[PDB]
Design a protein around this ligand. Structure first.
Ligand SMILES: *Cc1c(COP(=O)(O)O)cnc(C)c1O
Lengths: 239, 62
Protein backbone atom coordinates (compact mmCIF):
# COMPACT_ATOMS: atom_id res chain seq x y z
CA UNK A 1 0.00 0.00 0.00
CA UNK A 2 2.15 2.85 -1.33
CA UNK A 3 0.75 3.93 -4.72
CA UNK A 4 0.08 7.64 -5.27
CA UNK A 5 -1.75 8.77 -8.41
CA UNK A 6 -1.37 12.22 -9.98
CA UNK A 7 -4.05 12.69 -12.65
CA UNK A 8 -4.20 15.29 -15.44
CA UNK A 9 -1.85 18.16 -16.34
CA UNK A 10 -3.04 21.76 -16.18
CA UNK A 11 -0.20 22.87 -18.48
CA UNK A 12 0.69 25.81 -16.23
CA UNK A 13 3.81 26.02 -14.06
CA UNK A 14 2.47 27.13 -10.67
CA UNK A 15 0.56 23.83 -10.43
CA UNK A 16 3.10 21.38 -11.90
CA UNK A 17 6.06 22.68 -9.84
CA UNK A 18 4.49 21.60 -6.51
CA UNK A 19 3.93 18.21 -8.15
CA UNK A 20 7.62 17.92 -9.02
CA UNK A 21 8.65 18.96 -5.50
CA UNK A 22 6.24 16.42 -4.00
CA UNK A 23 7.58 13.73 -6.35
CA UNK A 24 10.97 13.87 -4.62
CA UNK A 25 9.44 13.97 -1.12
CA UNK A 26 7.07 10.99 -1.33
CA UNK A 27 9.86 8.69 -2.54
CA UNK A 28 11.78 9.23 0.71
CA UNK A 29 9.02 7.42 2.66
CA UNK A 30 8.68 4.47 0.23
CA UNK A 31 5.83 5.42 -2.11
CA UNK A 32 5.25 4.56 -5.77
CA UNK A 33 4.29 7.46 -8.05
CA UNK A 34 2.15 6.83 -11.13
CA UNK A 35 1.07 9.29 -13.85
CA UNK A 36 -2.30 8.30 -15.35
CA UNK A 37 -3.58 9.79 -18.58
CA UNK A 38 -7.26 10.61 -19.07
CA UNK A 39 -10.28 9.87 -16.86
CA UNK A 40 -10.51 6.25 -18.03
CA UNK A 41 -6.87 5.73 -17.00
CA UNK A 42 -7.46 6.42 -13.30
CA UNK A 43 -10.47 4.08 -13.24
CA UNK A 44 -8.24 1.17 -14.30
CA UNK A 45 -5.75 1.88 -11.48
CA UNK A 46 -8.33 1.03 -8.78
CA UNK A 47 -10.14 -2.13 -9.91
CA UNK A 48 -6.94 -3.82 -11.11
CA UNK A 49 -4.60 -2.18 -8.55
CA UNK A 50 -5.81 -2.57 -4.96
CA UNK A 51 -2.61 -1.20 -3.36
CA UNK A 52 -3.56 2.42 -4.15
CA UNK A 53 -4.39 5.00 -1.48
CA UNK A 54 -3.62 8.40 -3.02
CA UNK A 55 -5.39 10.26 -5.83
CA UNK A 56 -4.11 13.73 -6.75
CA UNK A 57 -6.14 15.72 -9.27
CA UNK A 58 -7.32 19.26 -9.95
CA UNK A 59 -10.58 20.12 -8.20
CA UNK A 60 -11.48 22.77 -10.80
CA UNK A 61 -11.34 20.35 -13.74
CA UNK A 62 -13.22 17.13 -12.88
CA UNK A 63 -15.36 17.81 -9.81
CA UNK A 64 -18.22 15.52 -10.92
CA UNK A 65 -16.65 12.91 -13.23
CA UNK A 66 -14.29 11.62 -10.52
CA UNK A 67 -16.20 12.10 -7.26
CA UNK A 68 -18.97 9.80 -8.58
CA UNK A 69 -17.11 6.85 -10.12
CA UNK A 70 -14.60 6.54 -7.27
CA UNK A 71 -17.41 6.62 -4.70
CA UNK A 72 -18.96 3.60 -6.46
CA UNK A 73 -15.78 1.55 -5.86
CA UNK A 74 -14.37 2.66 -2.48
CA UNK A 75 -15.78 4.78 0.35
CA UNK A 76 -12.73 5.50 2.54
CA UNK A 77 -10.29 6.04 -0.34
CA UNK A 78 -8.32 9.25 0.35
CA UNK A 79 -8.70 11.91 -2.36
CA UNK A 80 -5.79 14.38 -2.34
CA UNK A 81 -7.63 16.88 -4.52
CA UNK A 82 -6.02 20.31 -4.93
CA UNK A 83 -8.52 23.17 -4.83
CA UNK A 84 -8.16 26.78 -5.98
CA UNK A 85 -9.51 30.20 -5.01
CA UNK A 86 -12.91 29.95 -6.74
CA UNK A 87 -13.75 26.40 -5.68
CA UNK A 88 -16.96 25.02 -4.19
CA UNK A 89 -18.90 21.79 -3.73
CA UNK A 90 -21.87 20.45 -5.70
CA UNK A 91 -25.43 19.62 -4.67
CA UNK A 92 -24.95 16.11 -6.12
CA UNK A 93 -22.01 15.44 -3.75
CA UNK A 94 -23.92 15.16 -0.46
CA UNK A 95 -24.89 11.46 -0.47
CA UNK A 96 -21.44 10.09 -1.35
CA UNK A 97 -18.84 8.60 1.01
CA UNK A 98 -15.52 10.25 0.14
CA UNK A 99 -12.36 11.45 1.90
CA UNK A 100 -11.18 14.68 0.25
CA UNK A 101 -8.00 16.35 1.54
CA UNK A 102 -7.53 19.92 0.32
CA UNK A 103 -4.14 21.57 -0.17
CA UNK A 104 -2.56 24.57 -1.89
CA UNK A 105 0.18 25.33 -4.43
CA UNK A 106 2.75 26.76 -2.02
CA UNK A 107 6.46 26.41 -2.74
CA UNK A 108 8.86 25.13 -0.10
CA UNK A 109 6.08 23.50 1.95
CA UNK A 110 6.37 20.18 0.08
CA UNK A 111 7.95 18.56 3.14
CA UNK A 112 4.96 19.37 5.35
CA UNK A 113 2.61 17.91 2.72
CA UNK A 114 4.51 14.60 2.71
CA UNK A 115 4.07 14.27 6.49
CA UNK A 116 0.32 14.85 6.17
CA UNK A 117 -0.05 12.15 3.50
CA UNK A 118 1.83 9.59 5.61
CA UNK A 119 -0.31 10.36 8.66
CA UNK A 120 -3.50 10.23 6.58
CA UNK A 121 -2.45 6.87 5.14
CA UNK A 122 -1.86 5.57 8.67
CA UNK A 123 -5.40 6.63 9.59
CA UNK A 124 -6.73 4.66 6.62
CA UNK A 125 -4.91 1.54 7.82
CA UNK A 126 -6.20 1.87 11.40
CA UNK A 127 -9.79 2.29 10.13
CA UNK A 128 -10.42 -0.46 7.56
CA UNK A 129 -8.73 -3.07 9.75
CA UNK A 130 -10.70 -4.67 12.60
CA UNK A 131 -9.56 -4.03 16.19
CA UNK A 132 -8.40 -7.65 16.53
CA UNK A 133 -6.13 -7.58 13.48
CA UNK A 134 -4.95 -4.03 14.21
CA UNK A 135 -3.92 -5.02 17.74
CA UNK A 136 -2.01 -8.03 16.39
CA UNK A 137 0.03 -5.92 13.96
CA UNK A 138 0.80 -3.32 16.65
CA UNK A 139 1.81 -5.96 19.21
CA UNK A 140 4.67 -7.12 16.98
CA UNK A 141 6.31 -3.69 16.72
CA UNK A 142 5.86 -2.76 20.40
CA UNK A 143 4.81 -5.68 22.59
CA UNK A 144 7.95 -7.62 23.61
CA UNK A 145 6.94 -9.75 26.60
CA UNK A 146 9.11 -12.57 27.93
CA UNK A 147 8.37 -15.90 29.63
CA UNK A 148 5.28 -16.73 27.59
CA UNK A 149 3.90 -19.49 25.34
CA UNK A 150 4.74 -20.91 22.87
CA UNK A 151 8.41 -21.71 23.45
CA UNK A 152 9.68 -20.21 20.19
CA UNK A 153 8.82 -16.67 21.39
CA UNK A 154 8.81 -14.96 18.01
CA UNK A 155 11.41 -17.30 16.55
CA UNK A 156 14.09 -17.17 19.24
CA UNK A 157 14.80 -20.90 19.57
CA UNK A 158 15.05 -21.22 15.78
CA UNK A 159 18.03 -18.82 15.77
CA UNK A 160 20.13 -21.25 17.86
CA UNK A 161 19.96 -24.36 15.64
CA UNK A 162 21.19 -24.89 12.06
CA UNK A 163 18.01 -26.74 11.10
CA UNK A 164 15.84 -24.10 12.79
CA UNK A 165 17.27 -21.20 10.79
CA UNK A 166 15.99 -22.68 7.52
CA UNK A 167 12.43 -22.88 8.87
CA UNK A 168 12.56 -19.35 10.32
CA UNK A 169 13.87 -17.71 7.13
CA UNK A 170 11.10 -19.26 5.00
CA UNK A 171 8.18 -17.36 6.54
CA UNK A 172 9.44 -14.13 8.07
CA UNK A 173 10.16 -12.24 11.30
CA UNK A 174 6.61 -10.87 11.48
CA UNK A 175 5.14 -14.37 11.03
CA UNK A 176 6.61 -15.97 14.16
CA UNK A 177 5.99 -12.89 16.31
CA UNK A 178 2.27 -12.98 15.46
CA UNK A 179 1.74 -16.51 16.84
CA UNK A 180 0.77 -15.74 20.44
CA UNK A 181 -1.41 -17.63 22.91
CA UNK A 182 -3.63 -16.14 25.64
CA UNK A 183 -0.55 -14.88 27.50
CA UNK A 184 -1.27 -11.28 26.39
CA UNK A 185 -3.43 -8.89 28.41
CA UNK A 186 -4.02 -6.12 25.84
CA UNK A 187 -5.48 -8.61 23.32
CA UNK A 188 -7.78 -10.70 25.53
CA UNK A 189 -8.53 -14.41 25.39
CA UNK A 190 -10.64 -16.23 22.82
CA UNK A 191 -12.09 -18.63 25.40
CA UNK A 192 -13.13 -15.71 27.62
CA UNK A 193 -14.68 -13.75 24.71
CA UNK A 194 -13.80 -10.37 26.23
CA UNK A 195 -11.90 -7.27 25.20
CA UNK A 196 -10.84 -7.25 21.55
CA UNK A 197 -12.44 -10.67 21.03
CA UNK A 198 -15.84 -9.37 22.18
CA UNK A 199 -15.99 -6.55 19.63
CA UNK A 200 -14.61 -8.84 16.91
CA UNK A 201 -17.56 -11.24 17.10
CA UNK A 202 -20.05 -8.37 17.01
CA UNK A 203 -18.29 -6.86 13.98
CA UNK A 204 -18.63 -9.99 11.84
CA UNK A 205 -22.30 -10.39 12.79
CA UNK A 206 -23.02 -6.87 11.55
CA UNK A 207 -21.24 -7.38 8.21
CA UNK A 208 -22.77 -10.78 7.41
CA UNK A 209 -26.12 -9.70 8.95
CA UNK A 210 -26.24 -11.89 12.05
CA UNK A 211 -26.73 -11.65 15.80
CA UNK A 212 -23.37 -12.87 17.16
CA UNK A 213 -21.10 -14.61 14.65
CA UNK A 214 -18.39 -16.95 15.92
CA UNK A 215 -14.86 -17.82 14.78
CA UNK A 216 -14.13 -21.55 14.76
CA UNK A 217 -10.40 -22.32 15.02
CA UNK A 218 -10.68 -25.93 13.81
CA UNK A 219 -12.65 -25.75 10.55
CA UNK A 220 -16.12 -26.46 9.25
CA UNK A 221 -15.96 -30.17 10.10
CA UNK A 222 -15.69 -29.25 13.79
CA UNK A 223 -18.37 -26.54 13.85
CA UNK A 224 -20.99 -29.07 12.72
CA UNK A 225 -20.21 -31.25 15.76
CA UNK A 226 -20.55 -28.49 18.37
CA UNK A 227 -23.89 -27.27 17.01
CA UNK A 228 -25.19 -30.83 16.63
CA UNK A 229 -24.61 -31.59 20.31
CA UNK A 230 -26.83 -28.64 21.31
CA UNK A 231 -30.34 -29.51 20.08
CA UNK A 232 -29.81 -33.28 20.52
CA UNK A 233 -29.78 -34.55 24.12
CA UNK A 234 -28.99 -38.14 25.14
CA UNK A 235 -32.15 -39.56 23.62
CA UNK A 236 -34.01 -37.33 21.17
CA UNK A 237 -34.75 -37.09 17.44
CA UNK A 238 -33.08 -35.01 14.73
CA UNK A 239 -33.97 -34.38 11.08
CA UNK B 1 -64.22 -10.52 54.28
CA UNK B 2 -62.44 -10.24 50.92
CA UNK B 3 -62.97 -6.48 50.68
CA UNK B 4 -61.82 -6.17 54.31
CA UNK B 5 -58.71 -8.34 53.93
CA UNK B 6 -57.51 -6.14 51.06
CA UNK B 7 -57.38 -3.13 53.37
CA UNK B 8 -55.20 -5.08 55.81
CA UNK B 9 -52.80 -6.12 53.04
CA UNK B 10 -52.76 -2.55 51.71
CA UNK B 11 -51.95 -1.26 55.20
CA UNK B 12 -49.29 -3.94 55.72
CA UNK B 13 -47.59 -3.28 52.38
CA UNK B 14 -47.68 0.47 53.08
CA UNK B 15 -45.37 0.04 56.08
CA UNK B 16 -43.07 -2.36 54.21
CA UNK B 17 -42.39 0.03 51.32
CA UNK B 18 -41.33 2.78 53.72
CA UNK B 19 -38.41 0.70 55.06
CA UNK B 20 -37.51 -0.84 51.68
CA UNK B 21 -34.07 0.83 51.76
CA UNK B 22 -32.78 -1.78 54.23
CA UNK B 23 -33.44 -4.80 51.97
CA UNK B 24 -33.04 -4.06 48.26
CA UNK B 25 -33.10 -6.63 45.45
CA UNK B 26 -29.83 -8.14 44.20
CA UNK B 27 -30.02 -10.05 40.91
CA UNK B 28 -27.46 -12.77 40.24
CA UNK B 29 -25.03 -12.28 37.35
CA UNK B 30 -24.56 -14.94 34.66
CA UNK B 31 -23.82 -13.13 31.38
CA UNK B 32 -21.70 -15.77 29.69
CA UNK B 33 -22.01 -16.33 25.93
CA UNK B 34 -25.29 -14.88 24.64
CA UNK B 35 -26.50 -11.98 22.51
CA UNK B 36 -28.16 -10.37 25.56
CA UNK B 37 -27.32 -10.07 29.26
CA UNK B 38 -29.69 -12.69 30.67
CA UNK B 39 -30.82 -12.50 34.29
CA UNK B 40 -32.39 -14.85 36.82
CA UNK B 41 -34.38 -14.51 40.03
CA UNK B 42 -33.41 -15.70 43.50
CA UNK B 43 -33.23 -19.49 44.03
CA UNK B 44 -34.47 -20.91 47.34
CA UNK B 45 -35.22 -17.43 48.72
CA UNK B 46 -38.41 -17.05 46.65
CA UNK B 47 -40.59 -19.93 45.44
CA UNK B 48 -44.05 -18.40 44.99
CA UNK B 49 -45.59 -18.03 41.53
CA UNK B 50 -47.47 -14.73 41.94
CA UNK B 51 -45.06 -12.87 44.21
CA UNK B 52 -45.18 -9.11 44.74
CA UNK B 53 -42.42 -6.53 44.35
CA UNK B 54 -42.13 -3.23 46.23
CA UNK B 55 -40.64 0.05 45.03
CA UNK B 56 -39.12 3.10 46.69
CA UNK B 57 -40.13 6.29 44.87
CA UNK B 58 -43.70 5.85 43.58
CA UNK B 59 -44.50 6.67 39.96
CA UNK B 60 -47.67 7.54 38.04
CA UNK B 61 -48.23 4.52 35.78
CA UNK B 62 -51.33 4.43 33.55
C1 LIG C 1 -15.60 -29.31 2.49
C2 LIG C 1 -16.77 -29.50 3.59
C3 LIG C 1 -16.47 -29.65 4.91
C4 LIG C 1 -14.98 -29.63 5.38
O1 LIG C 1 -14.53 -28.30 5.46
P1 LIG C 1 -13.31 -27.98 6.35
O2 LIG C 1 -13.37 -26.51 6.79
O3 LIG C 1 -12.07 -28.21 5.58
O4 LIG C 1 -13.32 -28.86 7.55
C5 LIG C 1 -17.50 -29.82 5.85
N1 LIG C 1 -18.84 -29.84 5.42
C6 LIG C 1 -19.13 -29.69 4.13
C7 LIG C 1 -20.61 -29.71 3.65
C8 LIG C 1 -18.08 -29.52 3.18
O5 LIG C 1 -18.39 -29.37 1.82
Amino acid sequence: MNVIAILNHMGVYFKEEPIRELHRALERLNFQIVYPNDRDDLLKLIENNARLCGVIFDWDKYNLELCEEISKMNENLPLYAFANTYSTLDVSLNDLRLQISFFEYALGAAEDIANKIKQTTDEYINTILPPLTKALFKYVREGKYTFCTPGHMGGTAFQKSPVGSLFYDFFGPNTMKSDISISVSELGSLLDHSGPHKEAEQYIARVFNADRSYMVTNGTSTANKIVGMYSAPAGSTIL
Amino acid sequence: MLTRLGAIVQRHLQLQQQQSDKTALTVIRLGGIFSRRQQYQLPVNVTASTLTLLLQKPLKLH
